[PDB]
Amino acid sequence: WEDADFPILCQTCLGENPYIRMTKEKYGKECKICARPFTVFRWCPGVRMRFKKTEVCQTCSKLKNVCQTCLLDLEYGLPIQVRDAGLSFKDDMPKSDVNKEYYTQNMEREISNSDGTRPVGMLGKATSTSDMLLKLARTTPYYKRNRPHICSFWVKGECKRGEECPYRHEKPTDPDDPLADQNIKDRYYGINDPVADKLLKRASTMPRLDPPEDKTITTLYVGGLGDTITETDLRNHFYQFGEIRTITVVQRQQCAFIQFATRQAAEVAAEKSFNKLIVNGRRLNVKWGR
Amino acid sequence: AKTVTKQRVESHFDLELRAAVMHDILDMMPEGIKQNKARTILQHLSEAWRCWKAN
Amino acid sequence: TGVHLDPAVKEVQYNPTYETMFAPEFGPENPFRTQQMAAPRNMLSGYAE
Amino acid sequence: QLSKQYSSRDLPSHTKIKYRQTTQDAPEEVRNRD
Amino acid sequence: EPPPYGYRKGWIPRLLEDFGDGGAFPEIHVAQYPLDMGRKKKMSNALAIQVDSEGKIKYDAIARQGQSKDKVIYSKYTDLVPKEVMNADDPDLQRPDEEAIKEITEKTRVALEKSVSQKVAAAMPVRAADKLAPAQYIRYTPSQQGVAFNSGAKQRVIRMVEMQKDPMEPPRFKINKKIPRGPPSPPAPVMHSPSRKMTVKEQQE
Amino acid sequence: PIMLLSGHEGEVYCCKFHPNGSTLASAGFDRLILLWNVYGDCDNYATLKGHSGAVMELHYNTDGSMLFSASTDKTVAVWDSETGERVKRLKGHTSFVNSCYPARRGPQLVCTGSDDGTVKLWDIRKKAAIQTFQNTYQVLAVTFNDTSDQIISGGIDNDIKVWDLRQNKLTYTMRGHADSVTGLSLSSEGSYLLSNAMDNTVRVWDVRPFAPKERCVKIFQGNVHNFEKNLLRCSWSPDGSKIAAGSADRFVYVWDTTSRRILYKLPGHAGSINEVAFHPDEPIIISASSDKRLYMGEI
Amino acid sequence: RKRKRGVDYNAEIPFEKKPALGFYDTSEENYQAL
Amino acid sequence: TMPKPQWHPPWKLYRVISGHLGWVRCIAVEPGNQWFVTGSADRTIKIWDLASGKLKLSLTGHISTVRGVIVSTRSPYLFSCGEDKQVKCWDLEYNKVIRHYHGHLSAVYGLDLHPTIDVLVTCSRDSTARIWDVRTKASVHTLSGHTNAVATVRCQAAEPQIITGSHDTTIRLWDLVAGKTRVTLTNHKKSVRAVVLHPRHYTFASGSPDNIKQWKFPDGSFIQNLSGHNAIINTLTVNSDGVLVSGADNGTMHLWDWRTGYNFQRVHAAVQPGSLDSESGIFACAFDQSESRLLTAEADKTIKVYREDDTATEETHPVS
Amino acid sequence: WQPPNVYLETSMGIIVLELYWKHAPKTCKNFAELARRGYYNGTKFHRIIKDFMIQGGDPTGTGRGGASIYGKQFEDELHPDLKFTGAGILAMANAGPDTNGSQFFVTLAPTQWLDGKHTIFGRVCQGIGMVNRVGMVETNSQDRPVDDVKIIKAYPSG
Known part of the structure; x- marks a missing residue:
C-alpha cells in the first residue's frame, strides 16, 4: 500500500474555509486504479456540504496528473480525455487484469525513483498547455460539487427527517442525459466520457480565426483598433512572429492590415491572436484581408 | 519455502546432487562450446549409478 | 559577489544575513510553466511544511 | 502488504543474546593474546 | 559575404548563406536563421548527445541510461588495464580508520534495528495497540494561486486527525496477488578478455 | 552549529540566560521550567516544578542567584536557583499575572503586571503589597526604571505608562503605538526602553531626567500578529546594538539600532517564536518558539 | 465471458517494454502495413 | 615487471586427520585457538583439538550436507548452514541448537557473520542472499539481483559491507543498510566460487577457473590478474603476511604473494x-589465528594440516 | 577596444559573438574585456529554455552571482532597431534595469518580448548549429541542465 503527506485535488474539491479539517485512515480502501490499499484522508468540504475523501492511489494520481478527488486535471481542470488531446497526448496504460497488475507494479517501482514534485513521464514533455486548454479551463470554483445526492425518499415524498434530508431534495435528473452515467473507471481511463465529448463539441464550436482561399491574400485585417495603438505596436504584435511586409492602420475605421512576408508566420500571429491579442486592452480581430 | 522432512529426503538429495553436478563441471569445466550436452552428462550419471548398484 | 545560498537547498547550515539568504536570481521567469509548474511545491501540487 | 498470518515458531523466544564474557574469550583477550 | 558593419542596411538575409561564417543581424528586422538557428524543431526522442570535458563521445550516458550518478558502470578500457602498485605504504592501500568505522557501526545499528522492530511487530499480529498520536498541524501552500479559490488566501493550515481502527476488524484486502517479476536492472557491460574459438580438434576432444 | 533544543511538552514562551550565561532557563505551557547547559553539547539537567498555570514570565536577578516567575495561576513565585525550590509565593494577585520585574541592584522588590487591572509592587521579605496603581485594565508588560523610582507598563490602551513610586500617579504616558503594547525591555544603557506590539511597528523611547517630552526615537518594521494573539517579547543586545525580536511568521527578527536595517530575518523555525534571549557574554541567541522546542544560533 | 489472461493478446501487447532510445531520430520513423 | 617479491618460506605437510564419513566441506577456527570445527557431507559437525588433532565432540542436527560453519567472535555461538535449506545457531554452553533461521528456498551455499553488529548473511542456490537479525530470527533484507546460485558471500565492517560472488560469473558489492547493489563486476568468465578480503589493505581477491583477480575497495577497481592455477578454484585464503593460498578442486593448491x-x-x-x-x-x-598453521578440508574425507618450514632460506629456495 | 568576434570555445563546441559597439558600446566593452579576462572559465549554463534561450556566464552558476567591469553592474545600452527577433541574440539580461552584470544570454528563436528589457548587443557569428544542439539538451526543473556544460576557452578576437 501507499503512504501520503496529504491529498491531491483541485481548489473546487479542496475547499473554501482557511482551516480545513480532514481525518486520516492508513490503508483505508482500494484505489480503483492501482486496485490495492491506499491511505484515505476525508475532508469536510463546506457548510452542510458533503464530506469528501481521497479516491485514488497517490501513484495512480501522479501517473496522469489529475485530481485524486475531483478527478479533473490539476493545471487546467477539464476531462482527462480533453486535456490529453489538448496536449495531443497518447498514453499507453494497459487494461486487462494481469496486464494491469503488472503495469501497476512496475509503475510504482519506477515512481519510487521520483522526488514527489511532478507527474512522471510524458506529463512534462506535453506541458505545452495549448490556449485551447487554457480557454476550455473553468474560471471560478464550481462549488456545486459538494451538494448532496437526490434524497430518493425526498424524490418520492418520504424524506421524513425534516430538513435533514441527507440529499438535495430537488427534481432528479432524467438519466436520458449523457451527462448522467459516466463510470468512474472509464472517466479515469479516458474511455468515452460524454462530458468530454461535450467539451470537444464546445471547443470545436468556440470561435477561432478563419482561413482564406488564395495564398496571395497576405493582407490581414485586424478589426477594432482604437487610437491608443502605434504602427510599431501593431508590428511588435506581429513582427518577430515572422516578417511583416506592410501594415495599414485604418484610423477612419479603427482597424489594421498586416501584409506578411511569411504566410505561416501570418497564420501563427493571427490565429494565436484571434480576439485575444490584448496589447493595451483592446479586442482586435485577426482575419485575412480582401 | 517448505522444510525437508522425511519423505523428501531422498528426493531432495537428488535435486541437490544433480544441481551440484550441473554447476560443477558441465558449466565450469566445459569448452564444449556449442551447448554443453549437460542433459546427457546427467544421463551418464544416472546410468553410472544403476551400474554401480547392479555391479 | 559574496556568499549567497542555493535557493533549492533547504538544508543550509551557515547563518545567512538578509541578502546572503534572499538574494534574487538573475533572468526571466520560465513561461513554459503552468502556475503549478512555477510555484514552489514539496508535493506534486503544492508545498506543505 | 503485510499479512496477519503467523506461526507457532515465530513466537518470541531466546530474546537476549549471550555475550561472550570475560573469562570465556572476549574480543579483548583476543586483542592481546600471543 | 555579410555586408559590413554600418553597411549592412537594406538587405534581409533569409538563406543561411548570407551569414557567411554565421551571424544574426540584430538591427535587420527579421528572425535570423544562420546555421539551423531560430527554428523550434520536431520533438524527437534522441536523448542529449553529451560530450566529455575533453571533446569525446561519452557513451557512459548510454551505459548509465536512466540511472543515477551513484552507479559505477565500468565500460572503459582504462578499467581493464592492470594498474601497478608496489607500496604496502600507499594511501591507496589503507582502510578507513576506526573512527569512521564506529560512526558507520552506530548508523547501521540504528537503522537496522528500527526496520527490524517493525518487521518483528509484524509477528506480534495481536498489536497491543498504542493510541493515536498527537494531532497534525500542517501548512499547505497550494500551487494554484488566485483570488477566487480559497476565497482569496495564499495558504491553508490544516488539521490532520488519525481515524480510529476498529479492533475487531478482520483484514480488509486480498493480499495474495501473483504477477511475474518486474524487469531487472540496466544490464552491466561484459568486460571480458578476448575469447578464443577452439580448434575443431579440441572440439572433438 | 544549529543546536536546536527540545524536551518541552508544549510551546516555549519564556527563555533567558544566566546573568552569568552559565545555565539556561526556558519554559512555556508545561507548567514547569526546563534548565540547560548553554555550552558543551547543550545539556539539560534540572527542571523547576510547581507553577499551576503556564509560567507567564521567568525573570532572573541580575547577579544570577534568585529566580522570580509570574504564573497565570494568580501568583508570582520566588525560587532559589541554587536549589530550584520556591522562596516565596507572592499571592494576592486577583487574576492572571503576566509579568514580573525584580529591581536590579536596588533593594529587594518586584513590580508585577497581571490580568486584574492593577500594577502591583511587592516585597520579597514581607509577603506584603507595597503599592498598587489601578489605571483601569490588565497589565501585560512591566519594566522598572534604572533608579527603581518609576514603573513602566504596557497594557491594552496602546498608551505606554510609567508611575512615580513616590508620587504614585501616572508619571509618563507616551503614545504612537498603532495597537496594544506587548513587550518592554530596558537596554543596558539604563535609559532606552524597547517596546514591541502586534501592530507591525516596534518603538524605542528614552526615560531620562529630560527627554524631548515626545520621545519616540527609533521604529522597526516586520513584527507580525495573527488570529493567535500570542505574547510578543523583545530585547536589546547586551551592548544595546542589535534589536532582537520574535513573531508569528516563524521568522526571527534581528535588526540594528544604528542603520535600523534588517540584519537577519532568519528562518529555520516551525513555530511562532515567543522569546529571544541574548547571551550576556557571547554572540549567542536562544529562540523559544511555539514549535515546542528552541534554537541556539551563533552570530 | 470470464477469461482472465485470454484477451491480453488480441487487445494489448501483453507485458510491454518500450524499446529504449539512443542518440538517434526515432519519432518520425514509422512503418507500412500488411 | 614488478619489485622483487618477498621470499616466503615453504610449507610442508605435517598432519592428516581422518574421521569423517563423507566429503569435508567447511572448516573454521575458534577465536582463542584451542579448537577448529569441520562440517562435512556426512551431516555431522565435528570439533577437533588444534594441538593434538583429537576429536573432542561431534554434533548431529542437520539433515544433509553441512556446507558452511562459522563461529561468533562476540558470543558463544556457532552458526551452521546446510543443504537442507536450514541455517542453525548452535549455542556452545549446552552444545545445543537454540535458534533457526527459516526462509531460504534451496540449499544454503555459505554463510558469514558481521563482526560489529549481530547480523548474519547467507547465500543460497535460489540466487539470493539474506540478512538475518541474529537475535530475532527475522529477515531484515533479501539481497536479490544475481541470476544463479550465489556461490559465496563475505562481509566486512568498512564499506561496502557485503560482497557476493555467484555462478552467473559476476560479483556484486552491496549496500547493507540500503540493501541493494552498488557495484557489479563482470570481469570473470567462469563462475566465481571464492572471494577473500585482506586483513589490513582495503583490498580483496576473487577466484575463478580463469584466474584470480585482485581489486580495490570501495568501488571495485581492477588491480592485477593472478594466473597459473587453471582448475576449478574452491577456496582463497589470505595470511597477514601476504601469503595467499588458492586451493583448487582437482586437488592442487598453490601459494602466492598477495602483493606482487x-x-x-x-x-x-x-x-x-x-x-x-x-x-x-x-x-x-x-589459516589458524597465529597464522602459523594452515588447515585444509578435502574431498577424500581428510583434514590435511600444513606447517611453516623453519630450515629454509632465500639461498635454499631462490625466488624467480 | 572592441574585440570584434569574441570566442568562447565551449565544451561541446565553439561559439563566437560579434557585438556592435555602435549599437552597444558599453556592454560590448564589458564582453570584450571580460572574455579577455577569462574569468568566465567554469561558467555552467545558468538557464536553458529549449528553443527559446540559452543563458550562462556566471562565476556562481546559481543565478545570484556575476559582476561587471564597472563594479557590480552598469546601465543598458538600449537600441531603437535591434531586437531579439531571432536566434543568437547576445544580450546580458537584467532582473531590474541598470543592473547588468556578468551573466550572458544567447537566444534560440524569436524573443521579441525581452526587447526593451534587454539591450540586444550582437550575434553569434559562429557556433549556431551547436547553439541549437545545446538548446535541445535535457535540463532539470531549474534550467541548470543535467549536463554540466562549460566553456573551454574564453578570449577575444585579436
Missing part, C-alpha cells in the same frame, strides 16, 4: 589410502 602476484609454491598432496585419484579435491582452507 607471484606463485611461489605448488602443493599436490596424495589421497588417503583407499581413494580414487579423482577423489582429490579441496573444499576448505583456513
Whole structure:
C-alpha cells in the first residue's frame, strides 16, 4: 500500500474555509486504479456540504496528473480525455487484469525513483498547455460539487427527517442525459466520457480565426483598433512572429492590415491572436484581408 | 519455502546432487562450446549409478 | 559577489544575513510553466511544511 | 502488504543474546593474546 | 559575404548563406536563421548527445541510461588495464580508520534495528495497540494561486486527525496477488578478455 | 552549529540566560521550567516544578542567584536557583499575572503586571503589597526604571505608562503605538526602553531626567500578529546594538539600532517564536518558539 | 465471458517494454502495413 | 615487471586427520585457538583439538550436507548452514541448537557473520542472499539481483559491507543498510566460487577457473590478474603476511604473494589410502589465528594440516 | 577596444559573438574585456529554455552571482532597431534595469518580448548549429541542465 503527506485535488474539491479539517485512515480502501490499499484522508468540504475523501492511489494520481478527488486535471481542470488531446497526448496504460497488475507494479517501482514534485513521464514533455486548454479551463470554483445526492425518499415524498434530508431534495435528473452515467473507471481511463465529448463539441464550436482561399491574400485585417495603438505596436504584435511586409492602420475605421512576408508566420500571429491579442486592452480581430 | 522432512529426503538429495553436478563441471569445466550436452552428462550419471548398484 | 545560498537547498547550515539568504536570481521567469509548474511545491501540487 | 498470518515458531523466544564474557574469550583477550 | 558593419542596411538575409561564417543581424528586422538557428524543431526522442570535458563521445550516458550518478558502470578500457602498485605504504592501500568505522557501526545499528522492530511487530499480529498520536498541524501552500479559490488566501493550515481502527476488524484486502517479476536492472557491460574459438580438434576432444 | 533544543511538552514562551550565561532557563505551557547547559553539547539537567498555570514570565536577578516567575495561576513565585525550590509565593494577585520585574541592584522588590487591572509592587521579605496603581485594565508588560523610582507598563490602551513610586500617579504616558503594547525591555544603557506590539511597528523611547517630552526615537518594521494573539517579547543586545525580536511568521527578527536595517530575518523555525534571549557574554541567541522546542544560533 | 489472461493478446501487447532510445531520430520513423 | 617479491618460506605437510564419513566441506577456527570445527557431507559437525588433532565432540542436527560453519567472535555461538535449506545457531554452553533461521528456498551455499553488529548473511542456490537479525530470527533484507546460485558471500565492517560472488560469473558489492547493489563486476568468465578480503589493505581477491583477480575497495577497481592455477578454484585464503593460498578442486593448491602476484609454491598432496585419484579435491582452507598453521578440508574425507618450514632460506629456495 | 568576434570555445563546441559597439558600446566593452579576462572559465549554463534561450556566464552558476567591469553592474545600452527577433541574440539580461552584470544570454528563436528589457548587443557569428544542439539538451526543473556544460576557452578576437 501507499503512504501520503496529504491529498491531491483541485481548489473546487479542496475547499473554501482557511482551516480545513480532514481525518486520516492508513490503508483505508482500494484505489480503483492501482486496485490495492491506499491511505484515505476525508475532508469536510463546506457548510452542510458533503464530506469528501481521497479516491485514488497517490501513484495512480501522479501517473496522469489529475485530481485524486475531483478527478479533473490539476493545471487546467477539464476531462482527462480533453486535456490529453489538448496536449495531443497518447498514453499507453494497459487494461486487462494481469496486464494491469503488472503495469501497476512496475509503475510504482519506477515512481519510487521520483522526488514527489511532478507527474512522471510524458506529463512534462506535453506541458505545452495549448490556449485551447487554457480557454476550455473553468474560471471560478464550481462549488456545486459538494451538494448532496437526490434524497430518493425526498424524490418520492418520504424524506421524513425534516430538513435533514441527507440529499438535495430537488427534481432528479432524467438519466436520458449523457451527462448522467459516466463510470468512474472509464472517466479515469479516458474511455468515452460524454462530458468530454461535450467539451470537444464546445471547443470545436468556440470561435477561432478563419482561413482564406488564395495564398496571395497576405493582407490581414485586424478589426477594432482604437487610437491608443502605434504602427510599431501593431508590428511588435506581429513582427518577430515572422516578417511583416506592410501594415495599414485604418484610423477612419479603427482597424489594421498586416501584409506578411511569411504566410505561416501570418497564420501563427493571427490565429494565436484571434480576439485575444490584448496589447493595451483592446479586442482586435485577426482575419485575412480582401 | 517448505522444510525437508522425511519423505523428501531422498528426493531432495537428488535435486541437490544433480544441481551440484550441473554447476560443477558441465558449466565450469566445459569448452564444449556449442551447448554443453549437460542433459546427457546427467544421463551418464544416472546410468553410472544403476551400474554401480547392479555391479 | 559574496556568499549567497542555493535557493533549492533547504538544508543550509551557515547563518545567512538578509541578502546572503534572499538574494534574487538573475533572468526571466520560465513561461513554459503552468502556475503549478512555477510555484514552489514539496508535493506534486503544492508545498506543505 | 503485510499479512496477519503467523506461526507457532515465530513466537518470541531466546530474546537476549549471550555475550561472550570475560573469562570465556572476549574480543579483548583476543586483542592481546600471543 | 555579410555586408559590413554600418553597411549592412537594406538587405534581409533569409538563406543561411548570407551569414557567411554565421551571424544574426540584430538591427535587420527579421528572425535570423544562420546555421539551423531560430527554428523550434520536431520533438524527437534522441536523448542529449553529451560530450566529455575533453571533446569525446561519452557513451557512459548510454551505459548509465536512466540511472543515477551513484552507479559505477565500468565500460572503459582504462578499467581493464592492470594498474601497478608496489607500496604496502600507499594511501591507496589503507582502510578507513576506526573512527569512521564506529560512526558507520552506530548508523547501521540504528537503522537496522528500527526496520527490524517493525518487521518483528509484524509477528506480534495481536498489536497491543498504542493510541493515536498527537494531532497534525500542517501548512499547505497550494500551487494554484488566485483570488477566487480559497476565497482569496495564499495558504491553508490544516488539521490532520488519525481515524480510529476498529479492533475487531478482520483484514480488509486480498493480499495474495501473483504477477511475474518486474524487469531487472540496466544490464552491466561484459568486460571480458578476448575469447578464443577452439580448434575443431579440441572440439572433438 | 544549529543546536536546536527540545524536551518541552508544549510551546516555549519564556527563555533567558544566566546573568552569568552559565545555565539556561526556558519554559512555556508545561507548567514547569526546563534548565540547560548553554555550552558543551547543550545539556539539560534540572527542571523547576510547581507553577499551576503556564509560567507567564521567568525573570532572573541580575547577579544570577534568585529566580522570580509570574504564573497565570494568580501568583508570582520566588525560587532559589541554587536549589530550584520556591522562596516565596507572592499571592494576592486577583487574576492572571503576566509579568514580573525584580529591581536590579536596588533593594529587594518586584513590580508585577497581571490580568486584574492593577500594577502591583511587592516585597520579597514581607509577603506584603507595597503599592498598587489601578489605571483601569490588565497589565501585560512591566519594566522598572534604572533608579527603581518609576514603573513602566504596557497594557491594552496602546498608551505606554510609567508611575512615580513616590508620587504614585501616572508619571509618563507616551503614545504612537498603532495597537496594544506587548513587550518592554530596558537596554543596558539604563535609559532606552524597547517596546514591541502586534501592530507591525516596534518603538524605542528614552526615560531620562529630560527627554524631548515626545520621545519616540527609533521604529522597526516586520513584527507580525495573527488570529493567535500570542505574547510578543523583545530585547536589546547586551551592548544595546542589535534589536532582537520574535513573531508569528516563524521568522526571527534581528535588526540594528544604528542603520535600523534588517540584519537577519532568519528562518529555520516551525513555530511562532515567543522569546529571544541574548547571551550576556557571547554572540549567542536562544529562540523559544511555539514549535515546542528552541534554537541556539551563533552570530 | 470470464477469461482472465485470454484477451491480453488480441487487445494489448501483453507485458510491454518500450524499446529504449539512443542518440538517434526515432519519432518520425514509422512503418507500412500488411 | 614488478619489485622483487618477498621470499616466503615453504610449507610442508605435517598432519592428516581422518574421521569423517563423507566429503569435508567447511572448516573454521575458534577465536582463542584451542579448537577448529569441520562440517562435512556426512551431516555431522565435528570439533577437533588444534594441538593434538583429537576429536573432542561431534554434533548431529542437520539433515544433509553441512556446507558452511562459522563461529561468533562476540558470543558463544556457532552458526551452521546446510543443504537442507536450514541455517542453525548452535549455542556452545549446552552444545545445543537454540535458534533457526527459516526462509531460504534451496540449499544454503555459505554463510558469514558481521563482526560489529549481530547480523548474519547467507547465500543460497535460489540466487539470493539474506540478512538475518541474529537475535530475532527475522529477515531484515533479501539481497536479490544475481541470476544463479550465489556461490559465496563475505562481509566486512568498512564499506561496502557485503560482497557476493555467484555462478552467473559476476560479483556484486552491496549496500547493507540500503540493501541493494552498488557495484557489479563482470570481469570473470567462469563462475566465481571464492572471494577473500585482506586483513589490513582495503583490498580483496576473487577466484575463478580463469584466474584470480585482485581489486580495490570501495568501488571495485581492477588491480592485477593472478594466473597459473587453471582448475576449478574452491577456496582463497589470505595470511597477514601476504601469503595467499588458492586451493583448487582437482586437488592442487598453490601459494602466492598477495602483493606482487607471484606463485611461489605448488602443493599436490596424495589421497588417503583407499581413494580414487579423482577423489582429490579441496573444499576448505583456513589459516589458524597465529597464522602459523594452515588447515585444509578435502574431498577424500581428510583434514590435511600444513606447517611453516623453519630450515629454509632465500639461498635454499631462490625466488624467480 | 572592441574585440570584434569574441570566442568562447565551449565544451561541446565553439561559439563566437560579434557585438556592435555602435549599437552597444558599453556592454560590448564589458564582453570584450571580460572574455579577455577569462574569468568566465567554469561558467555552467545558468538557464536553458529549449528553443527559446540559452543563458550562462556566471562565476556562481546559481543565478545570484556575476559582476561587471564597472563594479557590480552598469546601465543598458538600449537600441531603437535591434531586437531579439531571432536566434543568437547576445544580450546580458537584467532582473531590474541598470543592473547588468556578468551573466550572458544567447537566444534560440524569436524573443521579441525581452526587447526593451534587454539591450540586444550582437550575434553569434559562429557556433549556431551547436547553439541549437545545446538548446535541445535535457535540463532539470531549474534550467541548470543535467549536463554540466562549460566553456573551454574564453578570449577575444585579436
